[PDB]
Design a protein around this ligand. Sequence first.
Ligand SMILES: *[C@H]1[C@H](N)[C@H](CO)[C@H](O)[C@H](O)[C@H]1O
Ligand SMILES: *[C@H]1[C@H](N)[C@H](CO)[C@H](O)[C@H](O)[C@H]1O
Ligand code: NA
Ligand code: NA
Ligand code: NA
Ligand code: NA
Ligand code: NA
Ligand code: NA
Ligand code: NA
Ligand code: NA
Ligand code: NA
Lengths: 536, 533
Amino acid sequence: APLPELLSNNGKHALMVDGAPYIILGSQTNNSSNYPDALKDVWPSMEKMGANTLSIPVAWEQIEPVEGQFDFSFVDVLLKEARQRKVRLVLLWFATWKNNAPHYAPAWVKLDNARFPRVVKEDGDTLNSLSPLGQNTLAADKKAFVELMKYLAKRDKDHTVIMVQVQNEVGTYGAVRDYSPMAQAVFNAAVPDDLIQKLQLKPGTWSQVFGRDADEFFHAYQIARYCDEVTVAGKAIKNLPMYVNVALRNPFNPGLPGQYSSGGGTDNVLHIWKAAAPNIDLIAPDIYFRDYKTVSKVLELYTRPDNALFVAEIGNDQPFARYLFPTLGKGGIGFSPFGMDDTDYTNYPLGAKVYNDETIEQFAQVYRLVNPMMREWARLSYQGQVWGVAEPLDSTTETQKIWNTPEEKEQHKKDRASALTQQLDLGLWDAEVTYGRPMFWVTPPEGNTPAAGGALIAQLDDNEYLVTAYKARVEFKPSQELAGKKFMIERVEEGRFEKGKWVMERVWNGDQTDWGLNFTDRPHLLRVKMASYSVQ
Amino acid sequence: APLPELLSNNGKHALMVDGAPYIILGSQTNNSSNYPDALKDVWPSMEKMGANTLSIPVAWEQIEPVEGQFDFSFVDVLLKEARQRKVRLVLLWFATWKNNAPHYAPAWVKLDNARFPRVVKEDGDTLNSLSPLGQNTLAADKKAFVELMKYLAKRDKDHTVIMVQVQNEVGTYGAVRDYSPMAQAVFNAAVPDDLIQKLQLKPGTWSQVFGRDADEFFHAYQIARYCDEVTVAGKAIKNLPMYVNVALRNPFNPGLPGQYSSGGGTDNVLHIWKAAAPNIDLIAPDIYFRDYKTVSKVLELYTRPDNALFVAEIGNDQPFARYLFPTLGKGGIGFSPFGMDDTDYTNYPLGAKVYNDETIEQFAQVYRLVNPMMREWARLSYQGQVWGVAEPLDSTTETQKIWNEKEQHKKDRASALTQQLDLGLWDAEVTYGRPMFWVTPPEGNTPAAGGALIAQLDDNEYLVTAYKARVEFKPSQELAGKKFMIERVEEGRFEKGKWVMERVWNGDQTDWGLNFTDRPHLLRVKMASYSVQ
Ligand SMILES: *[C@H]1[C@H](N)[C@H](CO)[C@H](O)[C@H](O)[C@H]1O
Ligand SMILES: *[C@H]1[C@H](N)[C@H](CO)[C@H](O)[C@H](O)[C@H]1O
Ligand code: NA
Ligand code: NA
Ligand code: NA
Ligand code: NA
Ligand code: NA
Ligand code: NA
Ligand code: NA
Ligand code: NA
Ligand code: NA
């Protein structure tokens, strides 16, 4: 089997696994699940969820508890047990930074500030965040990362591990950058020529070149460099795809760096990160916003010709499940809900209040739409045209229920039906996606309670589309005036792929096609052929 | 075994299956279940329902996907699976019209308007409704139908398939008829003498003869002839019973043709359909009206000396189940609730919001009354006297609920929930929603659900079975000094056509009428007048 690789071409992207595009329909563990004993509490969720890929930490403290004394006993067991369950892995390298901090570095690292120095604030106080300009730190992290990758080269010939995250949520809370004498010496010095030439700027010192942004861009540049060097070193051993995951700032109202995690790949510093760390394959958003407007904005910012979309973290509460659809519609390579294990921890108010089969089942339901076509979908998304949408109104609040005049009620229902109707330009044909209405007749949509639906569409040919959707109606129509022809559905087939060949189960027709294509919680994969026809 | 056939004599009808009267206690699939892979989501509901007959589509598009290249692979599987389950079939031929439209016709038909022309409106816009004046369409439909019937003649010698529906809900929405120059040439022309003579009318052109009804009567005639032609051709091959099913207009407030599906067998054109299509066995209503008054009206209009009642489609929501009773009461040959499969579709608000075991059980409960006596009831319906009633108030509304003098409303609902049946020398009074003891007035079941069947066995003897109701017997006429009583009530079953007694109802079980809950009981009730001289 060939190595996994992130391919990029013509504004589009694919995670290759075993020589073809692949989608990560993932589960991520809680942060303390990276031990042999905890795996029994991980696997049952993954099976209930139907995930193909587990994201799980491998901690520097665990593999190198004493300096030079390595321990891959966790990695051994994890590999074997993944293989028994025929799932893949994304290993998360928790090392110099895990959520800005060194807690997962071995004690001989995190307790020796002299050797492995922290970020100093402008006021001279010290933050528990390791400086990207500590050369011993970089050397030490590199060396352990290399041993991990050596373990993979020796013991993972079939690439059970498909990708590695290098650090977890890098940056600094509480200051913009390192203000140490060591850091200040670099800040006062000329900006590296490499960055100047890539950005096509005038040479000068950090403050001369970037002004108001010098402190934050400096920290991003130094962090990116460090992560790049770590990545290069590991990939020299085994050239897996590697990525970084971002503690996002609010894209509409970020506040100041240091309120958010300064130096990470936030939307304002993506240009710095891409310039500085050409060996990092992509920069992944960690999504804990619940509201459709903010989530959608994040997906837009992180989907770039130079950046494959991977939702490396998202909340595991019900509202988050539907963001699978726009993720996949943007050509994303994967989606990884956080905290999908039974190790007795919930990060509520971020994720679900109660972790039970119902929590898992919200994701299982959407995953069951994609799993039966995963490779086909993956191919279409890289090489062709795909689309995807989620229900665009969040669930009605109690504040909103309380204020629910007879003419006012009517106007609001109208407003909401319009908001809950989405248009997709599919070339010669459009789709109209609507949420929360009967399977029969044309009563306006009123939304699902809770908000939950979505759809996937892939273009097979000029008049032919793959469609599957969830608690929604999909209706097709011409994209342009027909100049006197009529149109109809030629044929809608429900079916599946077997050995990459379409197998028809049944034809949808009559009531099933009179009123759009109506989907509940169950999985149906459709091929939809449209026709215009003359009546002259 | 002998061919199934519809008999009609002396104002009565029967569907003969295997040489004796038969009642269709049916189930009908949703519209996209006519494939091998879907049948696993059909059979379990049928079994939970206790249905004896499955109505399922056979689509023109599936049997002739490319012109002249026939494919009966579905019919094959369907026949074998039905026989394994020991049930019968009604095939629904979805061809030139399914609900006005050609969607089930093959691509080479529905995408070729030059060859197979659509209805043209008065303003020259075109509707997706195939014109009955399209002679290429009629020939093509006929040829494929003939091929289906050929398949049955060769491959169904035991008549698993007992009846065939020709098209599904014919007619046109959006226009009264085709106004294409081709159609206009016929409309301007003489009305066919055969129709003139059957209707005892003066000869003349369509507008001359029918005036304000010309447009609709023209479309009704032209669709009737088309359908009769397909029927005749298929019966030449194998003479099964064949019928058409009607997208009803509201009998009390129809609106205009084209608002409703113009040219179907609606109650105002039954006379045209009967004169134009003498080879179609019956015209069957499709019933989605929920309300007792309207359903009752529909049942009244479609049960005629020339028309056997078959409720070819009805909704599967709970209020519909009790309409089995008046359907059978009227001499109905069957009843076919729509949407009885697990293929993840509901037509709510027409049928049930949620399709589950509870949905099915509402029908299974009423079918359980009739299955144990199906052949005996079928016989008594054709060759004798039967009656059937449903609870005649619909479930109280939320705003009648938040309405509510109270003693007067209760007195009115009581009178309303009391039905009289004239059984010759004896009458029956059927009441709904009261205890099994004493005489407190009826208050209705919640939701509305009761009914009753009765068949006369001799002057003084009746077969009775009912559901969430009380049945009381009394003399029909004054007894001129005699008293009366129940002589004997026997609960039992038929075994090999013989009545087998289980027990005698008496004492409490007969002091207060004959009280039925949700469980099945079949009673033989013998009444007597007696002298006290
Ligand atoms: C993403 C996120 N902050 C969760 C919070 O529960 C967790 O800390 C993950 O490790 C982060 O990467
Ligand atoms: C009767 C009715 N219109 C239902 C609606 O779900 C369905 O279209 C059947 O095919 C019709 O015959
Ligand atoms: Na277009
Ligand atoms: Na367009
Ligand atoms: Na399927
Ligand atoms: Na065309
Ligand atoms: Na009869
Ligand atoms: Na009488
Ligand atoms: Na009388
Ligand atoms: Na009994
Ligand atoms: Na007597």
